[PDB]
């Protein structure tokens, strides 16, 4: 498994991010800042677990489509199922989103991850892309609400909060956008980008969307 | 206009690609190889014209949305309107696609470019993304036919033709995929990636999808 090196690097980076966020979060008194630390430390903690499992050869299955037996890391979705709504929750607490908006985004998020996983396991080559399309539409719904909805909510906050939101929103739009493209061209879809390069790409995206995101959030005044 | 440097580089690269393809095409006797040279030389020739126009300050308009006046290079679409179906035509001649398939892809292609252009000029921020979504669906229809349809047609050709098709199909899937993401995150959509970086990205994509593509096609035995 040539991709082990990027699984090992992902594990190391997630583990370091977790440990650092834990040290910093433990030393924080402010009750508001603490919620954000708790949510944000969990994100690389879940990713570290899943990266470790995959490094050790768990969460990989073979799925037949296109006349080959294809390796599918399904453990990625067990990670994303829990880490993606927690990242949304960070953004939603920052702008004081309402309960029904949170529920809509978490629900859409579940649809996005669940249909992605169904698509990843589908044996009919053509139906893989139907699931992928539904997954991407649920994603674009999320991005829409974050871009239009949350930006409007953030503008009623003090400028330091709105500023931090904008940065994190931009990071999120750019980083989340790339995932369905990686899936499309990688071993899950078209089969163009080989599994090792694809693992590198997801690792760079994962670390940036989780540790990178966390660093921007947890170093800002906006959480106090 | 900080983006001038990437417009100038794009012009130079398109011009060099045109000139080189013209020199080589002019020296070719084989009647089949000549069709492919004629179509493929036109692709960077049209791009060079549009890149030159933009460098000299044509094909740029200001479109109001999101409370700002935004610069939109519309000359890109005048290029893509003609260059994208010609690239499809190259692929279709390679695999001997039928007339109705060619007509479907060219039509979908027109929809893709035309709705993209409407989206790029739309003053209501939200409706920009509706046009973008329709444009991307027309694109995904094209990619679907190239991936499933044309691959099946290429498998009935001699292996050297099928091999060349696969490479060009993979280049196309990967390169075309990136365009709607650039538009989404760039000055046309979300406004996250500034115009200069966006111009760099489109220039790299343009040169790769046109000169890169042409180099692979025109250096192969598959056209003789
Ligand atoms: C020992 C068990 C299998 C026992 C039966 C196997 C299953 C997965 C294996 C690891 C991973 O493959 C990644 C990596 C590849 C390197 O090359 C060498 C080290 C490392 C950490 C492997 C060591 C070892 O081989 C493991 C633990
Ligand atoms: C001369 C006319 C305007 C006359 C009225 C303007 C309009 C667009 C201008 C060019 C582009 O801006 C790109 C580039 C910017 C560099 O900085 C200097 C060179 C260059 C090639 C420009 C030269 C010149 O300025 C042009 C031709
Ligand atoms: C190669 C396999 C993985 C293991 C290798 C790990 C690389 C080691 C790098 C450590 C160099 C810096 C020393 C240090 O421990 O802290 C440096 C640096 C400083 O931390 P910090 O202690 O907060 O700074 C205090 C500075 N004063 C002494 C002035 C008070 O910490 C980080 O920025 C950091 C960020 C992440 Br994400 C994770 C971590 I862990 C640290
Ligand atoms: C900086 C602003 C743009 C202007 C700078 C242009 C860069 C100049 C590079 C030329 C170095 C090589 C010399 C040459 O003219 O041909 C080299 C090279 C060789 O061409 P070619 O003549 O086909 O090779 C023949 C070799 N034998 C003599 C053995 C028969 O040509 C290219 O590969 C090429 C590809 C593209 Br796309 C465009 C072009 I034009 C050429
Ligand atoms: C839209 C889409 C996807 C998006 C996944 C996302 C947006 C993942 C983000 C993960 C993070 C932020 C992890 C840490 C998948 C599942 C690849 C399947 C194909 C369609
Ligand atoms: C889908 C989509 C787009 C795709 C454009 C493509 C696929 C361009 C390819 C250009 C080439 C190959 C040029 C040379 C646009 C127009 C950016 C608008 C947004 C939606
Ligand atoms: C050639 C075999 C090397 C085996 C090393 C495997 C364990 C890696 C654990 C991950 C700890 C961080 C280091 C990452 C650098 C490769
Ligand atoms: C004031 C800080 C900048 C505001 C906006 C952030 C720019 C977008 C950042 C996204 C970079 C992610 C790397 C992409 C790797 C594929
Ligand atoms: C016969 C079943 C119909 C399948 C419909 C698929 C539509 C989903 C979008 C297709 C994206 C395909 C891009 C493929 C490039 C490998
Ligand atoms: C600082 C002003 C420089 C002006 C040069 C403008 C003309 C560029 C024409 C393009 C020819 C290829 C060279 C590209 C390298 C910048
Ligand atoms: C035998 C040659 C390789 C077969 C498949 C080609 C791999 C995909 C090439 C696409 C690289 C384009 C660069 C992407 C820049 C964003
Ligand atoms: C009220 C008008 C409805 C608009 C529907 C837009 C759906 C199109 C997909 C949205 C993609 C938005 C991503 C935005 C990230 C900037
Ligand atoms: C108490 C606030 C600091 C961070 C809290 C930790 C939340 C659980 C993550 C522990 C994983 C090792
Ligand atoms: C607050 C408004 C609730 C809207 C309903 C959620 C829609 C789910 C997304 C559709 C994805 C295909
Ligand atoms: C947005 C993702 C960019 C794609 C990176 C392409 C690398 C593919 C190389 C294929 C190796 C054979
Ligand atoms: C005759 C075959 C070689 C290439 C033919 C040229 C097609 C028109 C492009 C001319 C642009 C300068
Ligand atoms: C040969 C079959 C013709 C199919 C009709 C073309 C459909 C256009 C694409 C829809 C994009 C929204
Ligand atoms: C698939 C396209 C990749 C996106 C490249 C991101 C560069 C954005 C930097 C923003 C500068 C402020
Ligand atoms: C084609 C993608 C469909 C995404 C739906 C987004 C609608 C915005 C909510 C009003
Ligand atoms: C959501 C994108 C819709 C694209 C349609 C592709 C259908 C494949 C033709 C049978
Ligand atoms: C959540 C919508 C269900 C649509 C499933 C379509 C299944 C086709 C393979
Ligand atoms: C080609 C389909 C036409 C749909 C246009 C919808 C316009 C909404 C702004
Ligand atoms: C979340 C959708 C699951 C439906 C399962 C269908 C598998 C053939
Ligand atoms: C993506 C890492 C940068 C985080 C530093 C925050 C700047 C105040
Ligand atoms: C190709 C669709 C064009 C329709 C124009 C509508 C502009 C408001
Ligand atoms: C993308 C440029 C490579 C073209 C060389 C063709 C290999 C036979
Ligand atoms: C033909 C099925 C395409 C799925 C589209 C769902 C948004
Ligand atoms: C060769 C493709 C690797 C690109 C990944 C860099 C982030
Ligand atoms: C990736 C962009 C980070 C900028 C940080 C400023 C708060
Ligand atoms: C609500 C409009 C979304 C456009 C989807 C077209 C494929
Ligand atoms: C800083 C972003 C530029 C990346 C473009 C390289 C192809
Ligand atoms: C970008 C991949 C090019 C490989 C060329 C082999 C024909």
Author numbering:
A (entry chain A), B (entry chain A): 7 to 230
Article excerpt on this structure:
Membrane proteins localize in the lipid bilayer of biomembranes and play a variety of important functions such as transport of various substances between the inside and outside of the cell, signal transduction, energy synthesis, and cell adhesion. We developed amphipathic compounds, phospholipid mimics and detergents bearing multiple halogen substitutions on aromatic rings for de novo phasing and revealing lipid-protein interactions.
The structural properties of HAD16 mimic a phosphatidylcholine structure. Microcrystals of bacteriorhodopsin obtained by the bicelle method were mixed with HAD16 and then SFX data were collected at SACLA (Supplementary Materials Section S7). This is most likely because of the smaller isomorphous and anomalous signal from HAD16, which contains only one I atom and one Br atom per molecule instead of three I atoms in HAD13a, as well as only one HAD16 molecule in the asymmetric unit when compared with two HAD13a molecules. The HAD16 molecule adopting alternative conformations binds to an interface region among three symmetry-related bacteriorhodopsin molecules. The long alkyl tail of HAD16 interacts with the hydrophobic transmembrane surface. The choline and phosphate group face the bulk solvent.
